[PDB]
Symmetry: C3
């Protein structure tokens, strides 16, 4: 796109603030930002807020979201679709023009780990170019294993294709499949979908801890066979709904846009790979690392 | 196939009649019928009764099916496999020769949403050319959410490939992935697997209604990440068995031949897309529409 | 690999012996063995013990495994990863050098049907070349349907690609997808992943029996849509954990490395195909047969 040549808009922080016991304001941008998806490989991504996947959003079950999208893209309109919400797509997920802002309101009445993404036609084009992310809706009454969990992180899986190539998006194998982590608390890593960061800078944990991961496979195209090497998932909640409760899974099958809450215990010090067991995708980037130390540091 | 050149057998209505409290007769054809799978693109499909996917069959849990296949194909034998039934495949799912009829009897003792398809070797060839469909077996004691449902439809997902090309069937990406709807009651739409009909003529519903969809992904080759934009599935019964009960799913992962009953509420007027979240497949046709109005009409 | 030219190491039997009420010794080899994966097609596979998939391992819930790998490969190091166990991957799943042995100890504290595989980088290369298998961990308190089961078998699904071709492994469609069976009791078939053996020499059962299959899809890359023609799965335990209990499924979706225990009744004499319903994979080998006779013999 001619109007994107040379464009690299610095990331803009997510803005959220609660405005009522059950109402939250959220302000995001659509912007064009260069991301290093593999060593030496820059992708001029279409993003929310300069991250791909976009920034993490967390709300409570029953919150109504008052969402504003500010479109910084000079020529391409964009929109927002939250899987968490009940809304009219043709009224509430509509396009925002270049250099304009739009505000939309809708309720998040279901707990879980939901994909969000741009909903502008062709949707495949907007997602593949990077306009995806996760919103977590915390269950009012928690998860029955809440009191067993020592530490938690968010992981997202996505693919990257040949740059803005709709033929490749529809008919080709992914060039890269990647994990990224999004921060839940101060001190947590916050990364983009790439082949290397979570290998060189693993997530940290302590020997003996039970770890919870909030995970989603945003695609656009592949399903995911999610597995942590050296453990078994004690408990799994499909899409993060506390009722969808499985136990003792080695691997969790996730649809495109599929989410889960998974919990597992790390019993020994060492480095534990995290992968999608579809190992062609793991070979093309989709391996993260969890470093388990005696203290949780290092 | 030389004997199929110029052949276009007009669709023949499904014949069903109950013959006992737990016995039902079913008569279908195998026939060669031109179907417009994309605008300007005719596929000379191998079909049951001139539809692809074939006509909807509904029986009750515990019904024994007395099934007759009349093979109108001038040269290719065909057969029928109902996933709903217990049967001997080598005795009951056997080939019917051109211009011949065969009758087979077997019980449907499990509730749910089952694929049916031709079982003639090579099975891939018969399914890919269009010989697939759904049979629903209604649970004797219903679903626990039966009294919450306001309206219901059937949706089927299938792929189309290069015409009768076994290399493409085995090794290539689908040319099209499509939704079709099959009528449950008088007035319901009844369509074929194509890229456009359910976009131009959406399914209809009323603001505030809870909708049930009986769905199956007949393939032949892909899995499906089934999602309705702007809602969350309140309740999901995997393969339509009332015991396989999930709640609050954003997206339902379906194997090839996999079925489900899904229920969701539409809270606002508008047009709600229905897709497989594997968006390369959605881009190649697999998007339907649900139009929600104040009255349910229009 | 030059040092593999002409190499064909005869299969070596698995060695297992119990050494305590909750401790078991296991000794396996890594070796290079020619396997006929399709008629006239030899694959010089990287294997455990000269089989691909490797030999079946069965232990009890709560057993600690004292595992020894003897690496017979003249030049390539190999390692072992059991999905059943809790372990430190960077200490316990480490490489064993050519002509060396390594011993590792870890507990199997979860019931189910688990993949095992070599964990040497690049892992895709070792799995695709044949270093995969299944370990079953029997539940301390069994399955609630144990008393209904008349007969049981193990089936594994895997793919084969162009010989040791990392480009094909990552980016290409499988050349073959295959089933194999591993013996649970004296007299059971024990076969390798190929396109023909379980067609020409089907598994045997008796009319009216309820059959249990322990199944795993080891990949490396594809998911599986597991289906037995002519029946419906009465009961399914995902990953073989008794808590993950589904009923009345036509087809069971399995991730790469995904496992299940499935149970179904065969009501009539005949030959029942077993397939992955992703029929491009079935067409390329992934069809087995179950022959049901009045006596269970023949
Ligand atoms: Cu507001
Ligand atoms: Cu966009
Ligand atoms: Cu979506
Ligand atoms: Cu009759
Ligand atoms: Cu046919
Ligand atoms: Cu079938
Ligand atoms: Cu020992
Ligand atoms: Cu190896
Ligand atoms: Cu593994």
């Amino acid at each position: 796109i001619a109007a994107h040549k040379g464009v690299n808009q610095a990331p803009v922080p997510l803005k959220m603030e609660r405005v009522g016991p059950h109402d939250v304001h959220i302000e995001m941008t659509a912007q064009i930002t260069d991301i290093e998806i593999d060593k030496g490989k820059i992708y001029k991504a279409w993003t929310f807020n300069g991250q791909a996947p976009g920034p993490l959003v967390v709300v409570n079950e029953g919150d109504t979201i008052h969402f504003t999208l500010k479109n910084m893209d000079p020529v391409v309109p964009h929109s927002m679709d939250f899987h968490a919400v009940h809304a009219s797509p043709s009224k509430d997920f509509i396009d925002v023009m270049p250099n304009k802002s739009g505000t939309f309101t809708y309720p998040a009445n279901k707990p879980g780990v939901f994909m969000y993404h741009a909903g502008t036609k062709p949707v495949l084009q907007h997602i593949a170019n990077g306009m995806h992310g996760v919103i977590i809706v915390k269950p009012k009454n928690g998860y029955p294993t809440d009191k067993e969990v020592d530490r938690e992180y968010v992981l997202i899986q996505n693919e990257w294709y040949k740059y803005n190539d709709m033929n490749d998006f529809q008919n080709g194998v992914p060039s890269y499949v990647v994990f990224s982590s999004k921060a839940l608390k101060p001190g947590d890593p916050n990364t983009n979908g790439d082949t290397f960061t979570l290998k060189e800078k693993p997530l940290l944990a302590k020997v003996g801890e039970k770890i919870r991961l909030y995970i989603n496979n945003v695609g656009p195209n592949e399903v995911s066979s999610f597995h942590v090497v050296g453990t078994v998932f004690d408990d799994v909640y499909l899409d993060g709904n506390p009722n969808n409760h499985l136990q003792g899974m080695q691997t969790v099958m996730l649809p495109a846009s599929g989410g889960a809450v998974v919990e597992f215990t790390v019993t020994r010090p060492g480095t534990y790979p995290i992968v999608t067991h579809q190992f062609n995708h793991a070979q093309k980037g989709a391996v993260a690392m969890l470093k388990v130390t005696e203290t949780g540091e290092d």
